[PDB]
Amino acid sequence: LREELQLLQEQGSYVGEVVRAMDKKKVLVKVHPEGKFVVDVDKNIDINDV
């Protein structure tokens, strides 16, 4: 609880929907309002899980 005050003075995270992935560890995501983005995946996740 004492540590907690700094951790919520920290930026949030977006949520989007994967249309479909393509080669070289990238996907294609419309977020909520805006266009579609070709972005990077994490190192903890896999391409096959998408």
Partner 1 sequence: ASKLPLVTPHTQCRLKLLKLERIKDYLLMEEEFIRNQEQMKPLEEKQEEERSKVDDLRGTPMSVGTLEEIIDDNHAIVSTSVGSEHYVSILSFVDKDLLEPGCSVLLNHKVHAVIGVLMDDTDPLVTVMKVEKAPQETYADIGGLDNQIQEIKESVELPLTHPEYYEEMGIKPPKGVILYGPPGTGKTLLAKAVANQTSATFLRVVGSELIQKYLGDGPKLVRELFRVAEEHAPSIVFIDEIDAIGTKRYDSNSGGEREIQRTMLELLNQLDGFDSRGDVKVIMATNRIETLDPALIRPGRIDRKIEFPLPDEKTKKRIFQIHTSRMTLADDVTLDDLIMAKDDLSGADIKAICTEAGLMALRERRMKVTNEDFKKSKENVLYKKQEGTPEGLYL
| Rounded-to-integer distance, Cα 13 and Cα 31, Å | 11
Does the protein bind partner 1 through residue 17 (CB under 8 A)? Answer: no
CB of 18 to partner 1, least distance (A): 14
Strands 36-40 and 26-30: antiparallel
Site for partner 1 in 30-49 (CB under 8 A): 34-40
Tell the smallest beta-carbon distance from residue 41 to partner 1 (Å): 11
How many residues at the interface with partner 1, by CB under 8 A? 7
What is the contact surface with partner 1 in residues (CB under 8 A)? 34-40
